[PDB]
Write a protein that binds this ligand. Sequence first.
Ligand SMILES: [Mg+2]
Ligand SMILES: [Zn+2]
Lengths: 49, 85, 611, 97, 1049
Amino acid sequence: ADSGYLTRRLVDVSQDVIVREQDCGTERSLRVTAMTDGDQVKISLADRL
Amino acid sequence: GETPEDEVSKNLLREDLENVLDTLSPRERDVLRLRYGLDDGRMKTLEEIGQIFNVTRERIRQIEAKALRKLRHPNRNSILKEYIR
Amino acid sequence: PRFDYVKIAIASPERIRQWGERTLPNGTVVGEVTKPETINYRTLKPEMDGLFCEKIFGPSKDWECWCGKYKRVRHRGIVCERCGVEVTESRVRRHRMGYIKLAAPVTHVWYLKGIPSYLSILLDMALRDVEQIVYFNAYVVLNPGNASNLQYKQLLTEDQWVEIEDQIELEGIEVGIGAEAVQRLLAELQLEEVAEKLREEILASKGQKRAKLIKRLRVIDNFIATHSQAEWMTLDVIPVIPPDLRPMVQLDGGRFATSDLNDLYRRVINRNNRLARLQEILAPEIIVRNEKRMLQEAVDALIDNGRRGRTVVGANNRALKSLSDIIEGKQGRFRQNLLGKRVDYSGRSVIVVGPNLKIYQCGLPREMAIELFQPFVIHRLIKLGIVNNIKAAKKLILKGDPQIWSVLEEVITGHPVMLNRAPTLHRLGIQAFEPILVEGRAIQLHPLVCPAFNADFDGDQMAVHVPLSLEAQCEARLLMLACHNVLSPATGKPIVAPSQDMVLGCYYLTAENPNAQKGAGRYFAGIEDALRAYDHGQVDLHSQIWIRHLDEDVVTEKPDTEVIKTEDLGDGTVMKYYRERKIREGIITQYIQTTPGRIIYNKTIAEALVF
Amino acid sequence: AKVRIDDGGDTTMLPGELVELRQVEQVNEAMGITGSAARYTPVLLGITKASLNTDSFISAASFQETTRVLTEAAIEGKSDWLRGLKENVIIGRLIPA
Amino acid sequence: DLIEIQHASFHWFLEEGLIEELNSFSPISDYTGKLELHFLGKDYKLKQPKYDVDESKRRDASYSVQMYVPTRLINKETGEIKEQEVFIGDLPLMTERGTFIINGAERVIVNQIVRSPGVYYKKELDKNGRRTYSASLIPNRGAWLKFETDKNGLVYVRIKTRKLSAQVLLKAIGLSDNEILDSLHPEFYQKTLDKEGNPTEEEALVELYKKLRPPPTVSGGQQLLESRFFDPKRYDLGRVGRYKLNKKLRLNEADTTRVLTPQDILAAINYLINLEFDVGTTDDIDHLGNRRVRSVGELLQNQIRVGLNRLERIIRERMTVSESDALTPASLVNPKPLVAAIKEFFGSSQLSQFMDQTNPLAELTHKRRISALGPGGLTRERAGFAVRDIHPSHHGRICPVETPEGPNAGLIGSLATCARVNDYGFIETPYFRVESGRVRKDLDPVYLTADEEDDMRVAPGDIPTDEEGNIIGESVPIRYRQEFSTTSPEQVDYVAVSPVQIISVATSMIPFLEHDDANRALMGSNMQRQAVPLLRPERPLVGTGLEAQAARDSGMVIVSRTHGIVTYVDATEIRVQPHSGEEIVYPIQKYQRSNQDTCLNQRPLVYAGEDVVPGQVLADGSATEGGELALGQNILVAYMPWEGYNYEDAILISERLVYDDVYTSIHIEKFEIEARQTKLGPEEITREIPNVGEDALRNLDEHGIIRIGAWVESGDILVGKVTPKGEADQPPEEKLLRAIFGEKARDVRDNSLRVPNGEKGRVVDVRVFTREKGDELPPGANMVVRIYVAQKRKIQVGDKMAGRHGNKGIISRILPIEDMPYLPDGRPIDIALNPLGVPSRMNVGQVFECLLGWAGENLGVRFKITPFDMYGEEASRDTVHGLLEEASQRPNKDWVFNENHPGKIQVFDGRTGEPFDRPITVGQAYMLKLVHLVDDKIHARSTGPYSLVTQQPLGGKAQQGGQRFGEMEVWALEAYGAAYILQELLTVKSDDMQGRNEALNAIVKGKSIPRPGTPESFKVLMRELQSLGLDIAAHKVQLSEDGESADAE
DNA sequence: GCTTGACAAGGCCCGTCCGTTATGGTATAATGGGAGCTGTCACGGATGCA
DNA sequence: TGCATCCGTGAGTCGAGGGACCATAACGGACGGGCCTTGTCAAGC
RNA sequence: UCGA
Ligand SMILES: [Mg+2]
Ligand SMILES: [Zn+2]
């Protein structure tokens, strides 16, 4: 009952997100690294790229 | 309300009832259409067909008596056989 | 038709009566509901004034009026001069709306009791202050001019107004009560001039109450851009729903199945006809004030039952269904009739595991396929010349002839069928299959699509859907087939894979049994020599077998590149010994120590990836 | 994606509303050729708050608080141009995806 | 006896419950005082019923009796006594099985658990502040007393409304300043007496009326406070409310039970003040000592109480308008508001549930359900995590295993085996006394009523004991104050009487319960209540021994009572003679319809000339073998994977289970038709129906109704009924077609009762109930025909089968006996189960059951193993492997046991004849056949009925409904590229009166058309928003034209 | 190839007949209503209370 | 101007099953005879 | 209420 109401709220907030154009021409980027949770790693850099 | 199974076959009845009427005479087909209410949405009596034509009574009755007699014979009317409900 | 955008606005009283009054070839219009009577008790015909009237909403039967003498299809588009019912179709009753003319104004419950109470924002009052004027609990000053101590829009109690009545100041002091004073307070507003009055109060001496004047300015600015009036928030004309949206049918036992909208519509007209009766015979003012308070509560319970006051009930002690309680809930018109519908050409059954089959193929029983593909079988029967119509085809289907199942076999070839299991978490819970007629009464599902549907064979039922149009068949095949859904949409990892019973068959096949060798340490000539030795009783499944394999791409657990136990033959030829390989260097030959179970596994990938 | 604009005296934009950050830079760059004013503070909305502050009143009334969305849409006079999903399902047309 | 919460509750109502309600209702007076009416409740008649037990089920009636009381109508001035018996109401009686018959359907009354009346204290922290203590004086019926205590020594009284000071209520009831402080520490009461004033006896009733009812009156303040807690017939503590007041507050007075004593309110304040001084106990709401249960004797006492109050208003409205004398007392009592009060409780209340009659195990379980819902219990939304968990006080009272999974997980419990409810409504458990480390198993138990928590030390029934000497173990695990500990055996006080005392009567039928998981034992107890009665049942070989007690208490087993000699036995009756009018007849029902479409057949067991004993089985039921219960069959099993036919919880059976009538049940369906009264003309049942020839008029006896014993198939005519029509609105196409061949249409319409799709069987009961025959009919009906059709269903592909350990599954393939694997003696294998589901769900007891039943197969001894042992590892492994060695010592059976692999043998393949590489565990499993058959899950629809408003297809198997394409199903197609499939599913398949006609015409003609119209559900929402006062419309944005579009017209 | 007198069949039309139905009246005196809510948890505004 | 209290808003998807009384005048459908209207039959132009 |  908690996961069903969470899935419904995620649909209506992102229902009009359709890929319409091919390119926009931006210059910003997102820096991604290895997801390390302290001592051990969980997601490597090869799995995020 | 009526189911769409009876409204679809009502439209298929028009495709087969007008098939046996096209093989008749053009004067014989005109009598059966305006009498029962085909292609106009309104039922007309026998005297109103006699006033738009130059022929008086007792002719439209014997034309329909001749039109209904030839359709009962088992000749060129084999598709109107299982329509009896 | 085709439209492009939908616009919603506040309905003016001239707009509500536009839907009510309709043009009729006479002197006056007849589209007003004046009586609370619905139908007659003796005959099942409605009355000439009421909520189910035929002179307002249209004829009950097709091409037949209420009084008689017009019951043919010849009269189309005329109005009977004796009764007044237009001779037309019966589908016009669900499109015509009547209206109820009130004798006193009534505030809308969505604008008063709502959040953040837009009626109290425009009046510059409080929530409890407007709620005391409405429902007749306090008086509001409408003209405090030429008075000693009086303010504009000041609440007065019942004991405070009778003291000013003894003092007549000595001028004209006008007060008001009910919605007649709120409508007068909204009609004398200054929406063009109050907008510039609040803008000079924001910049000078803002304080903590700057957001209060900002929120009031947003409501005033909306009434100038939309060209609306502030007095339209009170209701003078009440619209009426068409009668097919409040249906009144009779059950088998003789009782009638009415709706809760008919009981809420009757409470408005019964309290409106009593108010017109009390205002005619010059009733005492304590009875007219109590009658207008119940008229305010009847419309507010009709719009939103239980919003302001107590929830009214009927015969059963449940809550009555108002106009707003059919669209907001989980069982409303949005979440049960618009976003989700019950479809035709559908069915369901339990599922069983079908082995010895393929992907994109499902088992479909014969008595369920003859019902889902029923318009497709009937079309093939007339095309082949067996029958001539639908009545000859439907009698041939329900009879049970063996020629019908030969027609159904030729129809479903190439027709995709979408399979579906509730609940649908991800998008791979609805996949299309090519059905085949199987023996039994359950759906033979493939075991490889079982992690996709999250289906287990302990009571799961799956819904069956059949497309109709030619564009829907090409979308179910090119985009929704089960063979094109190997990878999951969440990650990049596949989900079509051996899961439970085929992993144990492949783990035992490529295992190492150190007791049942039966001929280990034998040299065979290639891959095909070991497959021909497994059909005989030569080698077991886990025997140590040297296989001559000239390829270098040999992967194994704990791989190595070092060479141990280097042995040199004659004429310079050196043997390169490994842990699992045996290469004759100068590469001449190469022997691989393996099991015949790993050769059958490696042969299966060769005949499946190379075609 | 949204921002809370403040100091509005030229464009009909009261301080306290939530508009997209791309729409503020589209009107500020279009007003720089004339010369006017002003500031805006970014806000973080939830998944149920950003769903009700959209440009469509049909998509917000079918989700949650039907009596509150239709009251705001009737007073402000909002208009739905049937853009995006969850409207053509209710209308009965093809989805734009 | 296992049914004592239903039999002893209705017996208390017939002698103590009905007498107490009529004594409190009497006497009544008028407005002037002319006459008085008083009843004599302890002399009622309770006359004979009208119909039989089996007759009331087929006649659609209720097994009820008429209630008559003698009534003396006296007058004050003139001396006259009018004695006359007046009819009171219709009371349905409890049958011999413990059930009621309401409208021909058997119903039970589920026992509802609520909170006990009394005072309960609770430490509450509303915020990060001081410690506040609250109170709640709960009565049986009336208003509540909630005493709270804020900071700085302020104790308040809240009587739903705003709170008020403690001195306002304590002085208005009548008290002095010296009678409060003498029985109170009074230093804490000075902080709440400073900021409260000091009111007198009359300076507190005025201020109490000003805050509760906001002019004050000196007479209005006394009538308001007395009507809440001191007036009769408006406030009741109950017999158990007086018991909980004298225990918690330690009061000296007792036996008040009617009026709230003002000295008890002073004791509740004194206990609340002392909680700040670190003395006193805080009560628990989930403790079973504070939670009561009520049954039919208590729930019926509240329905007559609210039914006699409606009768008091009419009895006072008839003795004032009629100012004349000489009137009969039989006309003063109107039975109509009291008849409708009893009929609402048995037929329209939520707590009166439909009885599950699949097998005798579900009938016994449904009469012992403990549900926390009902009119006065809890709510489905108000249930939290604490109320659904297991309390430590549930040890032996409520079953911790048997509960339904899903929505009602923990709210609907089940009573344990040895549990018993006393007269106060608390569950009790028996215990044996232990004296100096010796279990005194010589006398009766103690039956502790959950008072062993803070006082006694209780050991379970698992400790090794000696033969009357001592206890063997040195460390005995016990439970003391809801915590487990191991103490000395000389320090314990009580011990349990049985190891099955914790589990219920349905969980106790699972052998080796200690080896199975608690999650799969929850499913194994629920699947046992869904097993159908087979044609020839068979007793289990690994039974627990408790099946014989559950068969006799179900009520479907004929037992002897006379200790006589059996004389005559046939298939209908058993005639014996009693000895130390001597010929009694035991009737035997043959193929009676149940509530869940099963059979209730009884078979004779005894023979002529045999001595019987009181308590001996004379005739077993449908799902009952000789003596014990039998819900399934003992057949061979093998834990081996086949070629994908047992992949994910699937079952592979053989063909031997089909032709040997194994898992073959009889299902009796019932059809209904009625010749009602149409206002155009009366309907009658004829044989000459139009448009039906001789293809369906073969089984009618010239009356329109079928005969007995006629084989009906799908599509036949059971009752031929016609209905007159008066339309006369024929289309011009049908008028031309009829004018050619003649055959003018009649005024009747065929409304014959027909057999639904996928239904067949043999007709066994064609009982017709018409008027003028001695039976009552519903209004608007001329002839009521009831048809009972019985069919014999074998086991097929798609049926759901399960065992006693939660290993459910669905059969996917029925193989012949030559394809199944076979044992080395040549015997084939019936079921080839999958061993992969065993170690992932901890189903170890099903391996112990099949390996022990295989030892009992070769020996023929029918072991009875009780759960919850004995020596560790010497009682489960060496019992099975030790008894398998004894079966291998026979000279003909040497292949049964092997030394290398003990619980395995060598199995040969049936197709190729070669042995498998590894040995496979075989055994005799006990599988059941559930009610989830493949015939009840088949549904399909092309085009059927539609809805009334939205014009959408309906939903339901019995009314040709369509499958719902919900919101989660749209999101999958929206995530796909299927835009044309989404538009097709929403327009031409639902809610379009025009688009459905053109789409159906396109498939028959062969040319599909695009562009469907606007759906009907959007146009309904458009008219509903316009009726809310919102001017909503659709426009067009075309060039120099902004016009509104007409979607409707 | 069409036409005319004759013989009933039946739908509206216009009277009365009686069941059905809306409306007004009855004179001792009578003068503030009952039926539940009291075991859900979290968040966001709106009062109101110092 | 910040801290308590109260009210309104949400809380999974499919399927099966069962379920006071009376007097008096106005109003309207039913029945019946008269009047054209309409369908049909046998010869004769 | 009962199935997933
Ligand atoms: Mg499953
Ligand atoms: Zn008319």
